[PDB]
Amino acid sequence: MIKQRTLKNIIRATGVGLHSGEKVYLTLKPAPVDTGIVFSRTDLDPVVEIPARAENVGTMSTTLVKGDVKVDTVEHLLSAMAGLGIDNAYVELSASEVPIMDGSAGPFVFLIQSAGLQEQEAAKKFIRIKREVSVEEGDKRAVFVPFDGFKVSFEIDFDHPVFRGRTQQASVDFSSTSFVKEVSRARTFGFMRDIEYLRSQNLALGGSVENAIVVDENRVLNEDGLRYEDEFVKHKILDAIGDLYLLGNSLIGEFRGFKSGHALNNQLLRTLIADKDAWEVVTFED
Numbered sequence: 001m002i003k004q005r006t007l008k009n010i011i012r013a014t015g016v017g018l019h020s021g022e023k024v025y026l027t028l029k030p031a032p033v034d035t036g037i038v039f040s041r042t043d044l045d046p047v048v049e050i051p052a053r054a055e056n057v058g059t060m061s062t063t064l065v066k067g068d069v070k071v072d073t074v075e076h077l078l079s080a081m082a083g084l085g086i087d088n089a090y091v092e093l094s095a096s097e098v099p100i101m102d103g104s105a106g107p108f109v110f111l112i113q114s115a116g117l118q119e120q121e122a123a124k125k126f127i128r129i130k131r132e133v134s135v136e137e138g139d140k141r142a143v144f145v146p147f148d149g150f151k152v153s154f155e156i157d158f159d160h161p162v163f164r165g166r167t168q169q170a171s172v173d174f175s176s177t178s179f180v181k182e183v184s185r186a187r188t189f190g191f192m193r194d195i196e197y198l199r200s201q202n203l204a205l206g207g208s209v210e211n212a213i214v215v216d217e218n219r220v221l222n223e224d225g226l227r228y229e230d231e232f233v234k235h236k237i238l239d240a241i242g243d244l245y246l247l248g249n250s251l252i253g254e255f256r257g258f259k260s261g262h263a264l265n266n267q268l269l270r271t272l273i274a275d276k277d278a279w280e281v282v283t284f285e286d
């Protein structure tokens, strides 16, 4: 059977919160079969657990919420879990946000590969898209289509000159393309306009050229930090893989994003969940 996977060892990392700009302690731990990914606040008393599920989502990022308790910036760590096939894990945090690390899934990939993968004696569950499901918000669209595999496409025509008056497009089919090699290390674009406004309000205190490609009114300030061609759209694909993992299982299907973001992604998850004839849970015997 294709088996569930968890981590082989506990790993401890530290970084800084995107919003607080202060130290956060990150601990990844093995977890039992059918746990999913579960976030816990070990700075709180008693410790508060929030499963990484679509119905626990409460802007420019994905936030999990249970009452007055939150975990911000879950999408890059969930992308790494999805891209390495981790079904089951505990994520312990000393604060209300995942550390930003270098702004990609890369550091989480490295931590998981370093901890090692442990096979579990239970069949891995997949969510198979059986029919098309789409959501729209003005000119924005997000779509699930049936596909024998896992494929993530993204397109945006954005009217800032960094983009040269051209639509940015990328497609990744994970049967041919490596998540680790071709997606995991993509950083997002941070517009000075937006960052300066947040910092004036004592927000986004952790953001910098260390964790984003910083762009002014016209252009990229440090091209030396660029890792990929079409890096902005590769980051949107990284983001979407993380958001899709809130379904709780690996997807058998195709995602198509048209100027979509965290908000329209989560609306697509909720529309899929409601349309119960559009998906099924399947296992494989190799």
Ligand SMILES: NCC(=O)Nc1cccc(OC(F)(F)F)c1
Residues within 6 Å of the ligand: 018, 060, 061, 075, 100, 103, 188, 189, 190, 191, 195, 204, 206, 207, 208, 211, 212, 239
């Ligand atoms: N998925 C959304 C995302 O990756 N956002 C993000 C990443 C790094 C830095 C940052 O903040 C800032 F630097 F841009 F301000 C915001």
Ligand SMILES: [Zn+2]
Residues within 6 Å of the ligand: 075, 076, 188, 235, 239
């Ligand atoms: Zn992101």
